[PDB]
Amino acid sequence: AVPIQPVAGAALAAPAAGQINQIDPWIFQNFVQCPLGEFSISPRNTPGEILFDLALGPGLNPYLAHLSAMYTGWVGNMEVQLVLAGNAFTAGKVVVALVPPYFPKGSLTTAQITCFPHVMCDVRTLEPIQLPLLDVRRVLWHATQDQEESMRLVCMLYTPLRTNSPGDESFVVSGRLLSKPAADFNFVYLTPP
Amino acid sequence: QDLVPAAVEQAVPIQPVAGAALAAPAAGQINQIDPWIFQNFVQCPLGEFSISPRNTPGEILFDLALGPGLNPYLAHLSAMYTGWVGNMEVQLVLAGNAFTAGKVVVALVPPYFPKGSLTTAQITCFPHVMCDVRTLEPIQLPLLDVRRVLWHATQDQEESMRLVCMLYTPLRTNSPGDESFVVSGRLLSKPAADFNFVYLTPP
Amino acid sequence: QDLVPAAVEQAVPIQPVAGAALAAPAAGQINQIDPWIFQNFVQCPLGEFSISPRNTPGEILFDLALGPGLNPYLAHLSAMYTGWVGNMEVQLVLAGNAFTAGKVVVALVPPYFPKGSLTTAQITCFPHVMCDVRTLEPIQLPLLDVRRVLWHATQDQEESMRLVCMLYTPLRTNSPGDESFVVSGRLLSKPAADFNFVYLTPP
Amino acid sequence: SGQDLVPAAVEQAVPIQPVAGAALAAPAAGQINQIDPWIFQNFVQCPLGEFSISPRNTPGEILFDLALGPGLNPYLAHLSAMYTGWVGNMEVQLVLAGNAFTAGKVVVALVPPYFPKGSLTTAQITCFPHVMCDVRTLEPIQLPLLDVRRVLWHATQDQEESMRLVCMLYTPLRTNSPGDESFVVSGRLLSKPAADFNFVYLTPP
């Protein structure tokens, strides 16, 4: 339950696009790993470390990035899930925020990361955490051969890791980020690659 | 038999512009503002200018831009939200004596208009208001939200409805007159009922 | 197609404030006053001021306070009663010629506002009225009874709705002009229909 | 995800009856003022909502003390620059998610106005409506902070006597770990306005 309205996908681009092209239905059935969507927490990290930050688009997917070479545009939401590898004796919390597609850049403290629509997940949670990546925008559709500003997913260390370690290693907790297109991801126009 | 009457004197006609109706299926949120900010004309952050008797007709006295920056209340709220879309309502006061003769014109220049140099002949071809310098009651105008995008980001480089004010006729006084007689002018503004921010962020 | 009109010129909007409706279950009595005191604007005990051509913009010309002390009739009645609660209605006249150019602003400053120093930029952010110095017909304002307590005691140290008047633009005359040309101003006031005293005591 | 913790931080009864918020201050204010409705949705961290509990702390150590007002919210502290007045209750979470080896208990009290500030011994903090909570509770302990008062509203001039919220360390923090390490629990504090929070009068920021 994150406080955001649903945002229209292909329902807004359709009157203006010339085609609206579907994706293989076997692509929505798999979670693939996002580039740079990996991190690790060591008990040496102080709260406030940006563990990752990555933007919405077709570059979050090995298949979508390859298919965007034929098409002119794209609209749609994505669907990301987060896996963490930690046992039952760890302690520490991570906040995942949904940064609007502006609000450019700076140092984000923990007092500020909780002011976005966010999910505050612990570190000893078993099941992968699901959340959406919404396509907030000011234009009707985006262009595949032009990287413009889109909504970003940001990860922050909210409460620091408190665990043990025999003598080695420092027992880092690893974290990975997987994604797949939501129901209303679409391309726009068939062009030659 | 149909009648003469001369008095019309105001009321630029407008066609209503869609506010968050266009933006809703695309913005993540659409945030209302306090309903009493719509009730008061308060002075812009940059709402000061003066007309000296030595200005030639055609010189642009001031030029604002439709945004959340023409209102002290909206400029304080805009720190939290990442966007805005809506209309404004502007009101200008001119403090002139009963011996200063002149007229200014206030026009609504669209976005994407070639940002060149406007003459006195072209200024009167936009939706405008003519107001002399002697008048006592403030005049006011609507500032609509003509735009090609759904909503605006709070980064003032983007083009929007500008508000230009030129000197239509030269400011001459029949008396000998000291040249240190500038005519003061102030700008005030409040959001029309179709204004709202977009997305909650930290300030 | 929707219309331009420029003329609004007055009428600060108000939300009605509860008079003795809040106070009744706590005051021992609630005393009406003569119904004809509501009919006449009469001059305050401290309703005199003047604007000299040598004052800079921002200087506070006068500052009254919502109470039974802005009315000669109420100030005579207040000797018998120990309290009051209600709204007022103020009317200011400015005796200016047709050659003096300037504008004053009249704002309604709430209680518990930090009693510092108000600029010309912050004065226009309270519910206000702009009035030039040449105008002939008197302007009037409502003075509401914003308060944290149920009723007020007739001991003027307590904070209530103040009424500030600043010089928005500097008073300049196009003619050479004698500096002994102060512009006179008077204040008048009468209780709005929601005023009444509280408890009968000896005068 | 081990469940040998104490997730028993369910809604407890605090001996206090509901309190009027903006309903009383409506006919004495001067205008209609409502605040954004998305502010009421998410819990965000207070401007002073971080603390820590070290095992070198003795029972009686005040972890935090804060008065009810707009200073408990980054969104409300920014809006409170334009207004002179506020009424209403607020809701606070308490994120004490210590390790599976710690031990200890804090007690959050609800101190009324006009109580003498300062010492507030540990024998006299259970005399108030209190919540006694462990340091291992997973789910964030929610609890209301109400606007008990004797005026119609509070000015945004912090000198008003408002209801406080004291967090004593009732018992000392200990660790049962097999060797050399005593974990320090880092507590956070989130808050959001209740359904009856409202500001009073518009003034320049």
From TrEMBL, chain A:
Report the locations given in the UniProt record: Host cytoplasm; Virion
Which superkingdom?
Answer: Viruses
Where does the Calicivirus coat protein domain lie? 1-193
Q: Which family does it belong to?
A: Belongs to the caliciviridae capsid protein family.
Tell me what this protein is called. Answer: Capsid protein VP1
Q: Organism source for this protein?
A: Norovirus (isolate Mouse/NoV/United States/MNV1/2002/GV)
Parent-record interval covered: 29 to 221 of 541
